[PDB]
Coordinates of C-alpha atoms in Angstrom, one line a residue:
Chain R
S17 CA 125.7 143.8 80.3
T18 CA 124.2 142.2 77.1
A19 CA 122.0 140.3 79.6
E20 CA 120.6 143.4 81.3
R21 CA 120.1 145.2 78.0
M22 CA 117.8 142.3 76.9
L23 CA 115.9 142.0 80.2
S24 CA 115.0 145.7 80.4
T25 CA 113.3 145.8 77.0
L26 CA 111.3 142.6 77.8
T27 CA 110.4 143.7 81.4
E28 CA 108.9 147.0 80.1
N29 CA 107.1 145.2 77.3
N30 CA 105.1 143.4 80.0
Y31 CA 107.4 140.3 79.9
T32 CA 108.0 139.8 83.6
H33 CA 107.5 136.0 83.7
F34 CA 110.2 133.5 82.8
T35 CA 110.7 129.7 83.1
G36 CA 113.7 127.5 82.4
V37 CA 116.2 124.9 83.6
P38 CA 119.3 126.2 85.3
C39 CA 122.3 125.5 83.1
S40 CA 125.8 126.8 82.5
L41 CA 125.3 128.3 79.0
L42 CA 122.9 131.1 79.9
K43 CA 124.0 131.3 83.5
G44 CA 124.1 135.1 83.6
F45 CA 120.4 135.5 82.9
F46 CA 119.4 133.1 85.7
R47 CA 121.8 135.1 87.8
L48 CA 120.0 138.3 87.1
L49 CA 116.5 136.7 87.3
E50 CA 117.2 135.6 90.9
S51 CA 119.2 138.8 91.6
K52 CA 116.1 141.0 91.3
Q58 CA 112.1 145.7 89.5
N59 CA 109.8 142.7 89.9
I60 CA 110.4 139.5 88.0
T61 CA 108.9 136.1 88.6
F62 CA 111.1 133.1 87.6
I63 CA 110.0 129.5 87.9
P64 CA 113.0 127.0 88.0
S65 CA 112.0 123.9 86.1
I66 CA 113.2 120.3 86.3
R67 CA 112.8 119.7 82.5
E68 CA 112.1 121.8 79.4
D69 CA 108.7 120.3 78.7
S70 CA 107.6 121.2 82.2
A71 CA 108.9 124.7 81.7
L72 CA 106.9 125.0 78.5
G73 CA 103.7 123.8 80.3
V74 CA 104.2 126.3 83.2
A75 CA 104.8 129.1 80.7
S76 CA 101.7 128.2 78.7
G77 CA 99.6 128.1 81.9
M78 CA 101.0 131.5 82.9
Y79 CA 100.0 132.8 79.5
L80 CA 96.5 131.5 80.0
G81 CA 96.6 133.5 83.3
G82 CA 96.9 136.5 81.0
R83 CA 100.7 136.9 81.4
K84 CA 103.3 137.2 78.7
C85 CA 106.3 135.0 79.4
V86 CA 109.4 133.5 77.9
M87 CA 111.3 130.3 78.5
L88 CA 115.1 130.0 78.5
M89 CA 116.6 126.7 77.2
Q90 CA 119.3 125.0 75.2
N91 CA 119.3 123.1 71.9
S92 CA 119.6 119.7 73.6
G93 CA 116.3 120.3 75.4
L94 CA 114.3 121.2 72.2
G95 CA 113.4 117.5 71.6
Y96 CA 111.5 117.3 74.8
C97 CA 109.4 120.3 74.0
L98 CA 108.8 119.4 70.4
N99 CA 105.5 117.4 70.7
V100 CA 104.2 120.0 73.2
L101 CA 104.9 122.8 70.7
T102 CA 103.4 120.8 67.8
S103 CA 100.5 119.4 69.7
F104 CA 99.6 122.2 72.2
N105 CA 100.9 125.8 71.6
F106 CA 100.6 125.5 67.8
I107 CA 97.1 124.0 68.2
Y108 CA 95.8 126.4 71.0
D109 CA 97.8 129.4 69.7
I110 CA 99.6 130.0 73.0
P111 CA 102.6 132.2 72.1
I112 CA 105.8 131.6 74.1
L113 CA 109.0 133.3 73.3
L114 CA 111.9 130.7 73.1
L115 CA 115.4 132.0 73.5
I116 CA 117.0 128.7 72.5
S117 CA 120.7 128.5 73.1
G133 CA 122.9 125.0 64.0
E134 CA 122.2 123.4 60.7
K135 CA 120.5 120.4 62.4
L136 CA 118.6 122.8 64.6
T137 CA 116.9 124.9 62.0
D138 CA 116.5 122.0 59.6
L139 CA 114.5 120.3 62.3
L140 CA 112.6 123.5 63.3
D141 CA 111.4 124.3 59.8
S142 CA 110.6 120.6 59.2
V143 CA 108.1 120.9 62.0
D144 CA 107.4 124.6 61.2
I145 CA 108.5 126.9 64.0
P146 CA 109.7 130.4 63.0
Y147 CA 113.2 131.2 64.2
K148 CA 115.6 134.2 64.1
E149 CA 119.3 134.7 64.9
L150 CA 120.2 137.3 67.5
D151 CA 123.2 139.6 66.9
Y152 CA 124.7 140.8 70.1
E153 CA 125.5 144.4 69.2
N154 CA 121.9 144.8 67.9
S155 CA 120.0 143.0 70.7
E156 CA 116.6 144.4 70.1
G157 CA 116.0 144.1 66.3
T158 CA 116.0 140.3 66.6
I159 CA 113.9 140.2 69.8
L160 CA 111.5 142.8 68.6
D161 CA 111.2 141.1 65.2
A162 CA 110.3 138.0 67.2
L163 CA 107.8 139.8 69.4
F164 CA 106.2 141.3 66.3
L165 CA 105.9 137.8 64.8
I166 CA 104.4 136.3 67.9
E167 CA 101.9 139.2 67.8
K168 CA 101.0 138.4 64.2
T169 CA 101.0 134.6 64.9
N170 CA 99.9 134.2 68.4
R171 CA 102.3 131.2 68.2
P172 CA 105.8 130.7 69.7
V173 CA 108.8 132.0 67.8
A174 CA 112.4 131.1 68.6
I175 CA 115.3 133.5 69.2
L176 CA 118.6 131.7 68.6
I177 CA 122.0 132.2 70.4
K178 CA 125.6 130.9 69.8
Chain S
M1 CA 82.8 104.4 91.4
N2 CA 83.9 105.0 87.8
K3 CA 85.6 108.1 86.4
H4 CA 82.2 109.6 85.7
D5 CA 81.3 109.4 89.4
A6 CA 84.8 110.7 90.5
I7 CA 84.6 113.7 88.1
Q8 CA 81.1 114.5 89.3
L9 CA 82.4 114.2 92.9
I10 CA 85.2 116.7 92.2
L11 CA 82.9 119.1 90.4
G12 CA 80.5 119.0 93.3
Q13 CA 83.3 119.7 95.7
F14 CA 84.9 122.6 93.6
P15 CA 82.0 124.1 91.7
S16 CA 83.8 127.4 91.1
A17 CA 87.2 126.0 90.3
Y18 CA 89.1 126.2 87.0
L19 CA 89.7 122.7 85.7
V20 CA 92.7 121.6 83.6
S21 CA 91.8 118.1 82.4
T22 CA 94.4 115.7 81.0
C23 CA 93.9 114.4 77.4
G24 CA 91.8 111.2 76.8
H25 CA 88.9 109.7 78.6
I26 CA 89.2 112.2 81.5
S27 CA 88.6 115.3 79.3
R28 CA 85.8 113.7 77.3
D29 CA 84.1 112.6 80.5
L30 CA 84.4 116.0 82.1
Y31 CA 83.0 117.7 79.0
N32 CA 80.0 115.3 78.9
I33 CA 79.3 115.8 82.6
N34 CA 79.2 119.6 82.4
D35 CA 81.0 121.6 79.8
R36 CA 81.8 124.8 81.7
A37 CA 83.8 127.7 80.3
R38 CA 86.1 127.2 83.3
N39 CA 87.1 123.7 81.9
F40 CA 90.4 123.8 80.0
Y41 CA 90.5 120.6 78.0
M42 CA 93.7 119.1 76.7
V43 CA 93.5 117.5 73.3
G44 CA 97.0 115.9 73.6
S45 CA 100.3 116.7 75.3
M46 CA 99.9 113.9 78.0
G47 CA 101.9 115.2 81.0
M48 CA 101.2 118.9 80.5
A49 CA 98.0 119.3 82.4
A50 CA 99.8 119.7 85.7
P51 CA 102.5 122.1 84.4
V52 CA 99.8 124.3 82.8
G53 CA 97.8 124.2 86.0
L54 CA 100.9 125.1 88.0
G55 CA 101.5 128.2 85.8
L56 CA 97.9 129.2 86.2
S57 CA 98.0 128.9 89.9
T58 CA 101.2 130.9 89.9
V59 CA 99.7 133.9 88.0
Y60 CA 96.3 133.5 89.9
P61 CA 97.3 132.4 93.5
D62 CA 93.9 133.1 95.0
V63 CA 91.6 131.1 92.7
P64 CA 90.9 127.3 93.1
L65 CA 92.5 125.2 90.4
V66 CA 91.9 121.5 89.9
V67 CA 94.2 119.4 87.7
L68 CA 92.6 116.1 86.5
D69 CA 95.4 113.6 85.9
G70 CA 95.1 109.9 85.3
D71 CA 97.7 107.4 86.6
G72 CA 99.3 107.4 83.1
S73 CA 99.6 111.2 82.8
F74 CA 100.7 111.4 86.4
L75 CA 103.4 108.8 86.0
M76 CA 104.6 110.2 82.6
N77 CA 105.7 113.5 84.1
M78 CA 106.0 112.7 87.8
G79 CA 108.8 115.3 88.3
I80 CA 106.2 118.1 88.1
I81 CA 105.3 117.3 91.7
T82 CA 108.7 118.5 92.9
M83 CA 107.9 122.0 91.5
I84 CA 104.3 121.9 92.7
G85 CA 105.6 121.0 96.2
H86 CA 108.3 123.6 96.0
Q87 CA 106.1 126.5 94.8
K88 CA 103.3 125.5 97.2
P89 CA 100.3 127.0 95.4
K90 CA 97.6 127.3 98.1
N91 CA 94.6 126.8 95.9
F92 CA 95.9 123.9 93.8
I93 CA 94.2 120.5 93.8
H94 CA 95.9 117.6 92.1
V95 CA 93.4 114.8 91.3
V96 CA 94.7 111.5 90.2
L97 CA 92.0 109.2 88.7
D98 CA 93.7 105.8 89.1
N99 CA 92.1 102.7 87.5
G100 CA 95.0 100.3 88.1
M101 CA 93.7 96.7 88.1
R109 CA 100.7 95.0 82.8
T110 CA 101.8 98.5 83.6
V111 CA 104.0 100.5 86.0
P112 CA 101.7 100.7 89.1
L113 CA 101.0 103.9 91.0
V114 CA 102.1 103.2 94.5
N115 CA 102.1 105.4 97.6
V116 CA 101.2 108.5 95.6
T117 CA 99.8 110.3 98.7
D118 CA 102.9 109.6 100.7
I119 CA 105.1 110.9 97.9
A120 CA 103.1 114.0 97.4
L121 CA 103.5 114.8 101.1
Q122 CA 107.2 114.0 100.8
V123 CA 107.8 116.6 98.0
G124 CA 106.0 119.3 100.0
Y125 CA 102.2 119.0 99.3
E126 CA 100.1 120.3 102.1
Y127 CA 97.8 117.3 102.2
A128 CA 97.1 114.1 100.3
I129 CA 94.2 111.8 100.7
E130 CA 92.8 108.6 99.1
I131 CA 89.1 107.9 98.1
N132 CA 87.9 104.5 97.2
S133 CA 84.1 104.9 97.3
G134 CA 81.4 107.5 97.3
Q135 CA 81.4 109.1 100.8
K136 CA 78.7 111.4 102.3
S137 CA 81.4 114.0 102.9
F138 CA 85.1 114.4 103.1
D139 CA 86.7 117.4 104.8
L140 CA 89.5 118.8 102.8
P141 CA 91.9 121.4 104.3
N142 CA 91.1 124.6 102.5
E143 CA 94.8 125.3 102.0
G144 CA 96.6 123.3 99.3
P145 CA 98.5 122.1 97.5
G146 CA 96.5 118.9 98.0
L147 CA 96.5 115.6 96.2
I148 CA 93.3 113.6 95.8
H149 CA 94.0 110.0 94.8
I150 CA 90.7 108.4 93.6
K151 CA 90.6 104.7 92.7
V152 CA 88.1 104.2 89.8
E153 CA 86.9 101.1 87.9
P154 CA 86.4 101.8 84.2
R155 CA 83.1 101.1 82.5
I159 CA 80.6 106.5 75.7
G160 CA 80.0 110.3 75.4
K161 CA 79.9 112.7 72.6
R162 CA 83.3 113.8 71.4
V163 CA 84.3 117.3 72.6
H164 CA 83.0 119.9 70.1
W165 CA 85.0 123.0 70.8
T166 CA 88.1 124.0 68.8
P167 CA 91.2 124.5 71.0
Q168 CA 91.1 128.3 70.2
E169 CA 87.5 128.5 71.4
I170 CA 88.5 126.6 74.6
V171 CA 91.4 129.1 75.1
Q172 CA 89.1 132.2 74.6
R173 CA 86.2 131.0 76.8
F174 CA 88.6 129.9 79.6
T175 CA 90.8 133.0 79.7
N176 CA 87.7 135.3 79.3
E177 CA 86.2 133.6 82.4
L178 CA 89.5 134.0 84.3
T179 CA 89.9 137.7 83.4
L180 CA 86.3 138.8 84.1
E181 CA 85.9 136.9 87.4
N182 CA 88.9 138.4 89.0
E183 CA 90.4 141.8 88.2
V184 CA 87.2 143.0 86.5
Chain W
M1 CA 133.3 116.4 100.8
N2 CA 133.7 117.1 97.1
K3 CA 132.4 114.9 94.2
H4 CA 135.9 113.4 93.7
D5 CA 135.9 112.0 97.3
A6 CA 132.3 110.9 97.0
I7 CA 132.9 108.7 94.0
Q8 CA 136.2 107.5 95.5
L9 CA 134.1 106.3 98.4
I10 CA 131.5 104.5 96.2
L11 CA 134.2 102.9 94.1
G12 CA 135.7 101.8 97.4
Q13 CA 132.6 99.9 98.4
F14 CA 131.8 98.5 94.9
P15 CA 135.3 98.0 93.4
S16 CA 134.0 95.4 90.9
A17 CA 130.9 97.4 89.9
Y18 CA 130.2 98.5 86.3
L19 CA 129.7 102.3 86.4
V20 CA 127.3 104.3 84.3
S21 CA 128.1 108.0 84.9
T22 CA 125.8 110.9 83.9
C23 CA 126.9 113.7 81.6
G24 CA 128.6 116.8 82.9
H25 CA 131.3 117.2 85.6
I26 CA 130.5 113.9 87.2
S27 CA 131.9 112.0 84.3
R28 CA 135.0 114.1 84.1
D29 CA 135.6 113.6 87.8
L30 CA 135.1 109.8 87.5
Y31 CA 137.7 109.8 84.8
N32 CA 140.4 112.0 86.2
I33 CA 140.1 110.4 89.7
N34 CA 140.6 107.0 88.1
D35 CA 139.3 105.7 84.8
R36 CA 138.4 102.1 84.8
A37 CA 137.5 100.3 81.5
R38 CA 134.1 99.4 83.0
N39 CA 133.0 103.0 83.7
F40 CA 130.4 104.4 81.3
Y41 CA 130.8 108.1 80.5
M42 CA 127.8 109.9 79.0
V43 CA 128.3 112.9 76.7
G44 CA 125.0 114.8 76.8
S45 CA 121.7 112.9 77.3
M46 CA 121.0 114.2 80.7
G47 CA 118.6 112.0 82.6
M48 CA 119.4 108.8 80.7
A49 CA 122.1 107.1 82.8
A50 CA 119.4 105.5 85.1
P51 CA 117.3 104.0 82.3
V52 CA 120.2 102.5 80.4
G53 CA 121.5 101.2 83.7
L54 CA 118.1 99.7 84.3
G55 CA 118.3 97.9 81.0
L56 CA 121.8 96.6 81.9
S57 CA 120.4 95.2 85.2
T58 CA 117.5 93.7 83.3
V59 CA 119.7 91.7 81.0
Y60 CA 122.4 91.0 83.6
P61 CA 120.8 90.6 87.0
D62 CA 123.9 89.3 88.9
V63 CA 126.5 92.0 88.1
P64 CA 126.8 95.1 90.4
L65 CA 126.0 98.3 88.6
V66 CA 126.0 101.7 90.1
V67 CA 124.4 104.5 88.2
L68 CA 125.8 108.0 88.9
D69 CA 123.3 110.9 88.8
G70 CA 123.3 114.5 90.0
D71 CA 120.3 116.2 91.6
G72 CA 119.6 117.9 88.3
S73 CA 119.9 114.7 86.2
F74 CA 117.8 112.8 88.8
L75 CA 115.0 115.4 88.8
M76 CA 115.1 115.7 85.0
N77 CA 113.8 112.1 84.8
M78 CA 112.5 111.2 88.3
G79 CA 109.8 108.9 87.1
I80 CA 112.4 106.3 86.2
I81 CA 112.5 105.4 89.9
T82 CA 108.9 104.0 89.6
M83 CA 110.3 101.6 87.0
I84 CA 113.4 100.9 89.1
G85 CA 111.3 100.2 92.1
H86 CA 108.9 98.1 90.0
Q87 CA 111.5 95.9 88.3
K88 CA 113.5 95.6 91.5
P89 CA 117.0 94.9 90.0
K90 CA 118.8 93.1 92.9
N91 CA 122.3 94.5 92.1
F92 CA 121.3 98.0 90.9
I93 CA 122.7 100.9 93.0
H94 CA 121.4 104.4 92.3
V95 CA 123.7 107.2 93.5
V96 CA 122.6 110.9 93.6
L97 CA 125.3 113.5 94.2
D98 CA 123.5 116.6 95.2
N99 CA 124.5 120.3 95.7
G100 CA 122.2 122.5 97.6
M101 CA 122.4 126.2 98.6
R109 CA 117.9 129.1 92.1
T110 CA 117.1 125.4 91.4
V111 CA 114.4 122.9 92.2
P112 CA 115.5 121.4 95.5
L113 CA 115.7 117.6 95.8
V114 CA 113.7 116.8 98.9
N115 CA 113.3 113.6 100.9
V116 CA 114.7 111.5 98.0
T117 CA 115.4 108.5 100.2
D118 CA 111.8 108.3 101.5
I119 CA 110.5 108.6 97.9
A120 CA 112.8 105.9 96.6
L121 CA 111.6 103.6 99.4
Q122 CA 108.0 104.5 98.6
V123 CA 108.3 103.5 95.0
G124 CA 109.8 100.1 95.8
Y125 CA 113.6 100.5 96.3
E126 CA 115.1 97.9 98.7
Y127 CA 117.0 100.6 100.6
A128 CA 117.8 104.3 100.3
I129 CA 120.5 106.0 102.4
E130 CA 122.2 109.3 102.8
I131 CA 126.0 109.6 103.4
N132 CA 127.4 112.8 104.9
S133 CA 131.2 113.1 105.1
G134 CA 131.3 112.5 108.9
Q135 CA 130.3 108.9 109.1
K136 CA 132.9 106.2 108.1
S137 CA 130.7 103.1 108.4
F138 CA 127.4 103.8 106.5
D139 CA 126.3 100.1 106.6
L140 CA 125.0 99.3 103.1
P141 CA 122.2 96.6 103.0
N142 CA 123.3 93.6 100.9
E143 CA 120.5 93.9 98.2
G144 CA 119.1 96.3 95.7
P145 CA 117.8 98.5 94.3
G146 CA 119.6 100.9 96.6
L147 CA 119.8 104.7 96.5
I148 CA 122.7 106.5 98.1
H149 CA 122.3 110.3 98.5
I150 CA 125.6 112.0 98.9
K151 CA 125.1 115.7 99.4
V152 CA 128.4 117.3 98.3
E153 CA 130.2 120.7 98.6
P154 CA 132.0 121.6 95.3
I159 CA 140.1 122.2 87.4
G160 CA 139.9 118.9 85.6
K161 CA 141.1 117.2 82.4
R162 CA 138.7 117.0 79.5
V163 CA 138.1 113.3 79.0
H164 CA 139.9 112.3 75.9
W165 CA 137.9 109.3 74.5
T166 CA 135.2 109.3 71.8
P167 CA 131.8 107.5 72.4
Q168 CA 132.8 104.3 70.6
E169 CA 136.0 104.1 72.6
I170 CA 133.9 104.1 75.7
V171 CA 131.4 101.5 74.5
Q172 CA 134.1 99.1 73.2
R173 CA 136.0 99.3 76.5
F174 CA 132.7 98.9 78.3
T175 CA 130.9 96.0 76.5
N176 CA 134.0 93.9 76.1
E177 CA 134.5 93.2 79.8
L178 CA 130.8 92.4 80.3
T179 CA 130.6 90.0 77.4
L180 CA 133.6 88.1 78.8
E181 CA 132.4 87.7 82.3
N182 CA 129.2 85.6 82.0
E183 CA 131.3 83.2 79.9
Chain B
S17 CA 95.7 88.1 64.2
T18 CA 97.8 90.6 62.2
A19 CA 99.8 91.6 65.4
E20 CA 100.4 87.9 66.2
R21 CA 102.2 87.6 62.8
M22 CA 104.7 90.4 63.4
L23 CA 105.7 89.2 66.9
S24 CA 105.9 85.6 65.8
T25 CA 108.2 86.9 63.1
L26 CA 110.3 89.0 65.5
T27 CA 111.2 86.3 68.1
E28 CA 113.1 84.3 65.5
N29 CA 115.7 86.9 64.7
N30 CA 116.8 87.2 68.3
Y31 CA 114.9 90.4 69.1
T32 CA 113.1 89.5 72.4
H33 CA 113.5 92.6 74.7
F34 CA 110.7 95.1 74.3
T35 CA 110.0 98.4 76.0
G36 CA 107.4 101.1 75.6
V37 CA 104.6 102.8 77.4
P38 CA 101.3 101.0 77.2
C39 CA 98.4 102.6 75.3
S40 CA 95.2 101.6 73.6
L41 CA 96.3 102.1 70.0
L42 CA 98.8 99.2 70.2
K43 CA 96.3 97.5 72.5
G44 CA 96.5 94.1 70.7
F45 CA 100.3 94.0 70.4
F46 CA 100.8 94.9 74.1
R47 CA 98.2 92.4 75.2
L48 CA 100.2 89.7 73.5
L49 CA 103.3 90.5 75.5
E50 CA 101.4 90.6 78.8
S51 CA 100.0 87.1 78.3
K52 CA 101.8 83.8 77.8
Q58 CA 109.4 82.2 73.7
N59 CA 111.4 84.2 76.2
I60 CA 109.5 87.5 75.8
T61 CA 110.9 90.2 77.9
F62 CA 108.7 93.3 78.2
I63 CA 109.5 96.3 80.4
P64 CA 106.6 98.8 80.6
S65 CA 107.8 102.4 80.7
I66 CA 106.3 105.6 82.0
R67 CA 107.3 107.7 79.0
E68 CA 109.2 107.2 75.7
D69 CA 112.7 108.6 76.7
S70 CA 113.0 106.1 79.6
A71 CA 111.8 103.3 77.3
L72 CA 114.5 104.2 74.8
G73 CA 117.0 104.3 77.7
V74 CA 116.2 100.8 79.0
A75 CA 116.1 99.5 75.5
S76 CA 119.6 100.8 74.8
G77 CA 120.7 99.2 78.0
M78 CA 119.3 95.8 77.2
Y79 CA 121.1 96.2 73.8
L80 CA 124.4 96.8 75.4
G81 CA 123.6 93.7 77.5
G82 CA 124.2 91.7 74.4
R83 CA 120.5 91.2 73.7
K84 CA 118.6 92.9 70.9
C85 CA 115.5 95.0 71.6
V86 CA 112.5 96.8 70.1
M87 CA 110.6 99.8 71.3
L88 CA 106.8 100.2 70.8
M89 CA 105.9 103.9 70.7
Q90 CA 103.2 106.3 69.6
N91 CA 103.8 109.1 67.1
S92 CA 103.4 111.7 69.9
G93 CA 106.2 110.0 71.8
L94 CA 108.9 110.8 69.2
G95 CA 109.8 114.2 70.5
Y96 CA 110.4 112.9 74.0
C97 CA 113.2 110.7 72.8
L98 CA 114.2 112.6 69.6
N99 CA 117.3 114.2 71.3
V100 CA 118.5 111.0 72.9
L101 CA 118.1 109.4 69.5
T102 CA 120.3 112.0 67.9
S103 CA 122.7 112.8 70.7
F104 CA 123.2 109.4 72.4
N105 CA 122.3 106.5 70.2
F106 CA 123.9 107.8 67.0
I107 CA 127.1 109.1 68.5
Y108 CA 127.5 106.1 70.8
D109 CA 126.4 103.9 67.9
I110 CA 123.6 101.9 69.6
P111 CA 120.8 100.5 67.3
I112 CA 117.2 100.1 68.3
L113 CA 114.2 99.2 66.1
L114 CA 111.3 101.6 66.6
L115 CA 107.7 100.9 65.6
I116 CA 106.1 104.3 65.6
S117 CA 102.3 104.2 65.3
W118 CA 99.9 107.0 64.6
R119 CA 96.1 107.7 64.3
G133 CA 102.1 110.9 58.9
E134 CA 103.8 113.2 56.4
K135 CA 105.2 115.6 59.0
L136 CA 106.5 112.5 60.9
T137 CA 108.5 111.4 57.8
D138 CA 109.6 115.0 57.5
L139 CA 111.1 114.7 61.0
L140 CA 112.6 111.3 60.5
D141 CA 114.3 112.7 57.4
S142 CA 115.4 115.8 59.3
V143 CA 117.4 113.7 61.9
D144 CA 118.7 111.1 59.5
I145 CA 116.6 108.2 60.8
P146 CA 115.6 105.6 58.1
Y147 CA 112.1 104.2 58.1
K148 CA 109.5 102.3 56.1
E149 CA 105.8 101.8 56.3
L150 CA 104.3 98.4 57.0
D151 CA 102.9 96.3 54.2
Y152 CA 99.4 94.8 54.3
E153 CA 100.6 91.3 54.8
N154 CA 104.3 90.9 55.6
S155 CA 106.7 93.8 56.4
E156 CA 109.5 91.4 57.2
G157 CA 111.0 93.1 54.2
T158 CA 111.8 96.1 56.2
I159 CA 112.1 94.3 59.5
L160 CA 115.3 92.9 58.0
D161 CA 116.0 95.9 55.8
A162 CA 115.9 97.7 59.1
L163 CA 118.0 95.0 60.6
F164 CA 120.7 95.0 57.9
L165 CA 120.8 98.7 57.9
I166 CA 121.3 98.2 61.7
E167 CA 124.2 95.9 61.0
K168 CA 125.5 98.3 58.3
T169 CA 125.2 101.6 60.0
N170 CA 125.7 101.3 63.8
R171 CA 122.3 103.0 64.2
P172 CA 118.6 102.6 64.9
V173 CA 115.8 102.6 62.3
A174 CA 112.1 102.7 62.5
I175 CA 109.0 101.2 60.9
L176 CA 105.6 102.9 60.9
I177 CA 102.2 101.3 61.5
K178 CA 98.6 102.3 61.0

């Protein structure tokens, strides 16, 4: 459903590479990623490793996104602030509130909130901003 | 054999490989030895050289890729090996420059690399005439070095990115 | 076996041990099976049961403490074993309850724990009823498991007061 | 000598269990702990495991510090907010660097802090400490 509607837009915008840690909150997207259309998914032990793998994939000339949860954000923080915002390696972050965006803008990572009926206006706003920035921008979920 | 010698050894063994060097003395040493456009230097993010290299070897499975870790960067993100050993990239070379004399020691690294699924793992203590390495990775190279300089690396991270990815793109598909 | 039975078993062989369970279902199962005051339940902070257990062993070497991890929480912070094998806490027991079928597989964990310096590392399948445990640590017990429940109803400071009271009493 | 002074200060107030990952920025401090007061130092591989074992030694009745570099903060940030604070475990952190964005972050997650004085920052060692006794929670001091 909402899951497939997302994936299709990304997969035909050349976003066929995804990393993340398996976890209950976004279970359906891991479901679909290992269901099947050619997609490459790299299961990761921890979020910082998922970010590193995604950044390496990007260096391989491949646009990619990492699925995660709020609790993992801490682990990636230094990476994002010391690597992708320094090398300008854009990764889309679909991070799945007050505290979260306070922290984000304190360390300066653009974020948006997805509305479920209007999936693409949030994700395409985010894609446009990463095109302008060549830096990671976050898409937020419940 | 210091880190200078070990990095020159690795370069002489993989002249055409893309190198991802962990931050610190290893990146500075590699830059001073031979700043090639195929060297991707890390300015920080200790523990991320191996993940970035794994992603690169995923997208480009047929090109040789050398990750240059130290004992510190290796131990800080040891879990990466589980993914490296599961994905099994065939042209991936994990070098661990280990200057252990105070710290958590690096013990049985080759055995553990083999345990998690690496294709081979060897240890080098001194300069050898040759060593035969199986051409199919993933392979770990544990090199014991004794520390002993060098101009600070003068490329902005964005320039590093551009040179490195340009080399990658033009020497494969185009 | 299921996780309930696995932790019933470990409680059976270390009845006086001070537990430190990881976050997620493992905590809830530990509680609803039987809550002991000395069990530590973790809300969030995946991959942290083992370090705080190592600290507990460091200050209190002579008390049996078993850390409960899953394959996911173990993989998330695997390098802690290099510290656990280095410090060599003599009464630290490291349990990994693992579900295999998607995910990064946990492979040869007993060999790896032995390579980093654990005193022993064993795997218990449900068939054996002996599983002779060596009488010294650190020990790793790898219980591969085939997978309800009551929400645990105690806030973090309930859990810590219940926990630290018994410990402070016992050296005295 | 300047590092000698701080540790000599620290032993007296019953903080003797120290963790952290060794590095050349706090080279002098670390070298003091390695040589030989019942100093207990547990070298760590990375910052989140250091904070874990420090927490544990705290719950073991003893009181603990954690040496860490600026870069390390992220690795334990979550466990600072989602474990220490809600379970109410205090640790004193000495975050070193080389700045403003780091104070940004400390303010973001409600972690008090204060920079070290030229001579004697015992002021905020025990400000830190009495905030600890006040608040159920960890606090940091920042060096260099």
